[PDB]
Amino acid sequence: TPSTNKEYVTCRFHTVIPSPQVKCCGSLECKASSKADYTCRVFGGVYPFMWGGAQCFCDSENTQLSEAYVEFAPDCTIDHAVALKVHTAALKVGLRIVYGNTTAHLDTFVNGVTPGSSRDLKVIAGPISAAFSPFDHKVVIRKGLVYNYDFPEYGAMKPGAFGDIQASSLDATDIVARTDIRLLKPSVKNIHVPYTQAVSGYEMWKNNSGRPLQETAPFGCKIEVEPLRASNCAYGHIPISIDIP
Amino acid sequence: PPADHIIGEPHKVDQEFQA
Amino acid sequence: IQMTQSPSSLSASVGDTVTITCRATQSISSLLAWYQYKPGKAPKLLIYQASSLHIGVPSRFSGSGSGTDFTLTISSLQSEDFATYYCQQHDSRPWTFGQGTKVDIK
Amino acid sequence: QVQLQESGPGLVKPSETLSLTCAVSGDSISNNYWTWIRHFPGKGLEWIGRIYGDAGSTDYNPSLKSRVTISMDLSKNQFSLDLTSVTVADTALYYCASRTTVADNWFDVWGPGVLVTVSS
Amino acid sequence: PYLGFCPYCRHSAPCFSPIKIENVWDESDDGSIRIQVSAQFGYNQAGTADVTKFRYMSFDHDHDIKEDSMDKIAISTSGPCRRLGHKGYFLLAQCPPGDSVTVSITSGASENSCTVEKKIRRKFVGREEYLFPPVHGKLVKCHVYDHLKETSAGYITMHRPGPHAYKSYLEEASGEVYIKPPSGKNVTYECKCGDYSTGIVSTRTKMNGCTKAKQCIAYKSDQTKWVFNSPDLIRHTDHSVQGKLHIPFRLTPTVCPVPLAHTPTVTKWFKGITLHLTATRPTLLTTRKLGLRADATAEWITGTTSRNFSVGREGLEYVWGNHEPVRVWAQESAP
Amino acid sequence: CPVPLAHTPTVTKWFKGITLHLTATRPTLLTTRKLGLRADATAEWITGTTSRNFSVGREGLEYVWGNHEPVRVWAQESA
Amino acid sequence: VSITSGASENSCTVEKKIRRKFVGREEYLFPPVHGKLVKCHVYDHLKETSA
Ligand SMILES: *[C@@H]1O[C@H](CO)[C@@H](O[C@@H]2O[C@H](CO)[C@@H](O)[C@H](O)[C@H]2NC(C)=O)[C@H](O)[C@H]1NC(C)=O
Ligand SMILES: *[C@@H]1O[C@H](CO)[C@@H](O)[C@H](O)[C@H]1NC(C)=O
Ligand SMILES: *[C@@H]1O[C@H](CO)[C@@H](O)[C@H](O)[C@H]1NC(C)=O
Ligand SMILES: *[C@@H]1O[C@H](CO)[C@@H](O)[C@H](O)[C@H]1NC(C)=O
């Protein structure tokens, strides 16, 4: 077991698009909000139609307002990836100790100091002869699969890669993102706001995943999650001293 | 030497030989 | 959308059947709700959706209608339900009310 | 269950800001529509306005839009009424309303209500 | 229900369609998708939940609401889709793989369709490809869109509608502009025929100072409906949130069958193994050593073949598809 | 006739050469040519996200990303 | 091509590789709402023209 702390969560973004508003021979200015990747741009005359062929008076000096930002998808409550860092890992053995006729089941700490007891017996464990951990410094959990991907840190988003949508919790309102959405001046006569968007870096990381650490970690060592441990992991020799009564 | 590497404006002038 | 409550007043005894109509100036489909005003107390909903019963309300109370013309039929009238009748639509903002229909013991 | 109780001054001078209070008990403030309803004696009910809990969105009657402002207090489980420059026609019995449905014009719940008389 | 700008019409063009698809999710592992349309399903004229009929947006100047049933709705991607559930803006269907998704009403001879590009790629669980699930196999944890109607996968924010203007409420005759309203509705006007002008009018009434029909705007202030924050609408001046409706068909954890392939026949030789493998469908073989260096490799295998895998004193671990992991170790049988 | 427009490229600048950070959900044509004596024309249909290292000369280089307006760049002497 | 005269239908089939095509330098399924306006040539939908 290591000590783990989460940084953010990452899933497929939902590119929500607010409806345009017109004061269509007035004047509008770019506002500033706290949404995820808020891009706002003030454009020229398009003379937009929606269904009647006349949706604007005073057809010159004909500015409009464009708004675009991103937010979590509704299906991100399960289909999401959370980033973790680990620290120096601590190992735990479960020992069956049989002396004479009396047996005992015991789980103890591998540190060299802390003992484990089963009602008569004092046994200490540790340290390991060779320190080893299959976990790199940056790991990602995705539906029980742990990967050794070096994700970018908090706030340092790269579009087209993993970690381009970051939030401290799935229900957190402080969603931060720079996915490089860019707005374009509309040319069609009917009303619609154009936008270009880079591909989902979560879906890029899903397409370019590789194989899981359950099938990659050496030493015959499968990996369990919630929280993250490595189970039945065979390496080294453990010094054990038993205080037999 | 210039800090910028590529500028979006052409060279108006040409360098002479060994100058 | 304005309201013309019908009828303004009607005296009836216990066990009779009284019909109160609800006419809207515009087609409001069947989104209508009716209320029963008890003096010195908040009015309680009896019929929602112009045909559907609120839980707790008596089955004897039955409303009907669609579009602009609506009716409530009060069958087997008792003593506890002499009150003020108020049909309320919920389409336009804000919602409006009638002028009130008074029923009293004969 | 949801219980509402009105608590406002019963006698206010005309051309004065009317402030009335409805407290909410038994349920949170942020997940239901909250509504004020007036009822002048000798007349009928009339709409005032409404607020949503966690959003603060307000929709009011166009005639009274210029004189009705609604604020809410999540810490006190509180939503309030402000009516500026009252007249003698503003004398009415005032109800605060709430509904089992998150948002509905029809209100399942209703406070006992408070009487407000505007006179000199 | 509002009306949106569909990217593909009946014939070839874009057109404005009332069954316009906003976006499609395909996160379910069983091929089911969720479709957001601008029409409301499961509701009658009043809006009371009646399962047999749905309501949509009308193709005329009074801009009222018309209704139809599910016997004339269709979902298709490449072939016809099977319909499973519906609430309001949301649909769900089981579809074959295709490059796009289509929705269509068949209102007699007036048949309208909307098509939005979406690469519906077929997906599978486990490590083995399958067309239809076996009746026998390992029961593994899966993630599907549930069939229960009263579920919650999230919320969407809807707001009050903005100006919905027309040309049919305006008319030009002998150099002056007229406004014709319908019976019993008050249509507000706002345009500059010179100085700025506003007002509310319910009767045939004239204007002054302008001679062109295109210069003015008339729209009815109708509060009877809630519109989704769509990219095809001009919003109201007060764009604040006023209500929220549920997103049904939540992606639940359920258990699903996955196939089990042919169990391999292992021949034994000195410090190495060879798996005689048969697979009608591509399955994943993952091996790793039990030493300091993993030397892990993986390849999807179609047909039948044989793979030569060396085993050390530390040992080798292999997984053939969805079977239990089996670990092999070498002897010291030198010849 | 209508034709689509892709995402505008991201340019990272280095010594006598450019690298275009490109994103395209569909295969689109990228064509580059120099402004000197030798054109050195390169053309490849690109699907997905791929970064391409393009060496530019002093005379210049013109790259056409999709159906956009061709954009001409020139190299400096930042040795 | 096939007529369906009730229960007596007749069909004709000829082989031809009908491959889907596009214009410009970008491949697409259905025409976007936004983009560059470029020159292409389509078959005229009006019947009263001659080729
Ligand atoms: C259209 O406008 C007219 C005039 O403002 C409205 O008629 C008024 O309605 C109110 C409420 O019922 C009455 O108190 C007024 O006395 C009415 N005035 C007149 C001159 O009739 C009418 O209700 C409006 N209709 C709509 C659809 O909003
Ligand atoms: C996934 O990767 C493959 C190989 O690079 C590529 O052909 C395919 O288009 C990619 N799919 C997506 C859209 O991520
Ligand atoms: C596996 O080893 C045997 C014996 O050396 C050899 O005949 C065969 O060709 C090898 N096959 C592969 C996959 O290399
Ligand atoms: C492009 O050049 C940089 C710097 O030399 C290098 O790191 C990168 O790998 C190169 N990429 C390609 C496409 O060769």
- DSSP-derived secondary structure for E206-271: E--S---GGG--EEE---S--EE--TTS-B-SS----EEEE--S-EEEEEEEE---PPPEEEEETT
Instruction: Decide: A55 and E162 in contact? Cβ < 8 Å.
Output: no
State how far residue C30 is from chain E, nearest Cα, in angstroms: 5
Place of tokens 């100091």: A113
Residue E5: strand pairing partners: E16
Place of tokens 């990452």: A10
Ligand 1 mean position to E191 CA, how many Å?
A: 23
A157 burial level (CB within 10 Å; 0-12, 13-18, 19+): buried
Among all ligands shown, which has an atom nearest to the Cα of E277? 3
| Ligand 4 atom nearest to F17, measured from its CA | 2
Ligand 3 mean position to A213 CA, how many Å?
A: 29
The two tokens of residue G20 are 């889907």
C-alpha E180/C-alpha E173 separation (Å) is 12
Instruction: Decide: E38 and E54 in contact? Cβ < 8 Å.
Output: no
Which of E267, E273, E308, E311 to mutate for ligand 3's pocket (most ligand atoms within 8 Å of CB)? Answer: E308
How was this entry determined?
cryo-EM
F28 interfaces chain G, CB cutoff of 8 Å: yes
DSSP helix/strand/coil, E293:
coil
Chain-chain contact of G30 with E99 (C-beta, under 8 angstroms) = no
State how far residue A41 is from chain G, nearest Cα, in angstroms: 17
C-alpha E237/C-alpha E160 separation (Å) is 10
Nearest Cα neighbor of F5 from A211, A223, A184 is A184
Q: For CA atoms A26, A16, E89, D54, give the dihedral sign.
A: negative
Q: Look at ligand 2, atom 3, and give the residue with the nearest C-alpha.
A: A207
Instruction: Decide: A66 and A41 in contact? Cβ < 8 Å.
Output: yes
DSSP helix/strand/coil, F36:
coil
Nearest Cα neighbor of D86 from D44, D29, D48 is D48
Name every chain F residue with its beta carbon within 8 A of the beta carbon of A199: 23, 25, 48-49
CA atoms within 13 A on the CB side of C26: 17
Whether residue C2 has its Cβ less than 6 Å from ligand 1: yes
- Is the peptide bond preceding residue E14 cis, with omega within 30 degrees of 0? no
Whether residue C93 has its Cβ less than 6 Å from ligand 1: no
| Ligand 2 atom nearest to F25, measured from its CA | 13
Q: After which residues are there C–N gaps above 2.5 Å in chain F?
A: none
E279 interfaces chain A, CB cutoff of 8 Å: no
Chain-chain contact of E7 with G30 (C-beta, under 8 angstroms) = yes
Count of beta carbons in the 10 Å neighbourhood of residue C72: 22
Name every chain B residue with its beta carbon within 8 A of the beta carbon of F62: none
Could you give phi then psi for residue B6, rounded to 5 degrees? -130, 125
Helix/strand/coil percentages in chain B, nearest 5: 0, 10, 90
C-alpha C35/C-alpha C78 separation (Å) is 17
Q: For CA atoms E127, E131, E132, E137, give the dihedral sign.
A: negative
What beta strand segments (E) does chain A contain? 5-10, 13-14, 36-42, 65-72, 81-85, 91-99, 102-110, 115-117, 122-125, 138-142, 145-147, 165-166, 176-177, 182-183, 195-196, 222-224, 229-231, 240-243
| Ligand 3 atom nearest to E274, measured from its CA | 1
Ligand 3 mean position to E296 CA, how many Å?
A: 20
Place of tokens 């049904």: E248
DSSP helix/strand/coil, A201:
helix
State how far residue E199 is from chain D, nearest Cα, in angstroms: 14
Element holding B5 (H helix, E strand): none
C-alpha D88/C-alpha C76 separation (Å) is 42
Whether residue F27 has its Cβ less than 6 Å from ligand 2: no
Instruction: Decide: D64 and D49 in contact? Cβ < 8 Å.
Output: yes
C-alpha E50/C-alpha D3 separation (Å) is 32
Q: Give resolution, Å, one decimal.
A: 5.8
Name every chain G residue with its beta carbon within 8 A of the beta carbon of F6: 26
Q: Give the chains touching C; criterion: ≥3 Cβ pairs < 8 Å.
A: D, E
Ligand 3 mean position to E293 CA, how many Å?
A: 24
Ligand 3 mean position to A217 CA, how many Å?
A: 28
Whether residue E48 has its Cβ less than 6 Å from ligand 3: no
* 3-state helix/strand/coil string of C35-91: EEECCCCCCEEEEECCCEECCCCCCCEEEEEECCEEEEEECCCCCCCCCEEEEEECC
Among all ligands shown, which has an atom nearest to the Cα of F46? 2
Ligand 2 mean position to A203 CA, how many Å?
A: 10
Chain-chain contact of D95 with C42 (C-beta, under 8 angstroms) = yes
State how far residue F1 is from chain B, nearest Cα, in angstroms: 31
Name every chain G residue with its beta carbon within 8 A of the beta carbon of E117: 29-30
Whether residue F50 has its Cβ less than 6 Å from ligand 4: no
